[PDB]
């Protein structure tokens, strides 16, 4: 029922997170997103309301589907003998951010202004539903480039938020904390912040301020771009070595350089139309 059910185009990508095509619910014509995944492949597995065994990718989409947010939104799934094919919605016209720095480069602080606090709304509401992303980065995030709107993909290396210490991590060694390189030790929050420093410096610089190890252990964040000075010191804070001297959530969001946020819509008709 799979097959009937759903039309399929092209392939958007693939990668660690398996195969996507672009695709239509027949039922409507909404545009969809097709993921499929080989069991093989799959090493984190966990376990539904009446309990099933699902890959932990699908408890982690469901926790964060109900309702509408900054999340791409799993619709439906579906079980093969050797695969698991998840129904995800696609925003139509859309770019990846990653794409969209590429193209534009840096952005203006307007922009990464607005777009930085729909990523944290979007954290945020993984969080409250109990779920740790744990790969946000450039390329894991979407702009739905009519409505202004950024929508978070790939749970693949996602994990329940707990208040314990994770000694696991599959996620981009590139935004990972010091913490993890040093000692393959990181808290979920603390962690996802200095990741959040990482993309917000991506954002305003055009690319990531670390690429080696040595690097990130040294944290010492050096500006190639002109960037205002209430937009450094919250990416220094962000990024700070020791994740308790890191900003909480909503210290980020009191912070000055985020004061008087656009909506979306107002984004896109400024910078995207
Ligand atoms: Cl339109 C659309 C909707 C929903 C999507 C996805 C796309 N993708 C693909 C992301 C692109 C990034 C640029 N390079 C190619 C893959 C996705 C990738 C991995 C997990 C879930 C995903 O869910």
């Known amino acids: 029922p799979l097959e009937s059910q759903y039309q399929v185009g092209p392939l958007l990508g693939s990668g660690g997170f398996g195969s996507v095509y672009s695709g239509i619910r027949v039922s409507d014509n909404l545009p969809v997103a097709i993921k499929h995944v080989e069991k093989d492949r799959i090493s984190d597995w966990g376990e539904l309301p009446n309990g099933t065994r699902v890959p932990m990718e699908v408890v982690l989409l469901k926790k964060v589907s109900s309702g509408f947010s900054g999340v791409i ?111 393959h030790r990181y808290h979920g929050r603390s962690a996802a912040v200095w990741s959040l420093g990482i993309l917000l410096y991506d954002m305003v610089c055009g690319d990531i301020p670390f690429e080696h190890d040595e690097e990130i252990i040294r944290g010492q964040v050096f500006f190639r771009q002109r960037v205002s000075s209430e937009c450094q010191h919250l990416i220094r804070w962000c990024l700070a070595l020791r994740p308790s001297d890191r900003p909480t959530f909503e210290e980020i969001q009191n912070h000055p350089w985020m004061q008087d946020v656009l909506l979306p819509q107002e984004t896109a008709e400024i910078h995207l139309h």
Do not use: M
């Open 73 to 183: 939104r799993l619709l439906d799934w579906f079980e093969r003998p050797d695969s698991f094919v998840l129904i995800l919605e696609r925003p139509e016209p859309v770019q990846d951010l990653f794409d969209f720095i590429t193209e534009r480069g840096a952005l203006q602080e307007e922009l990464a202004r607005s777009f930085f606090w729909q990523v944290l709304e979007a954290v945020r509401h993984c969080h409250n539903c109990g779920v740790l992303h744990r790969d946000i980065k450039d390329e894991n995030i979407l702009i739905d480039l009519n409505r202004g709107e950024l929508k978070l993909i790939d749970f693949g290396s996602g994990a329940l938020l707990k208040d314990t210490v994770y000694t696991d991590f599959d996620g981009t060694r590139v935004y990972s904390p010091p913490e993890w390189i040093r000692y």
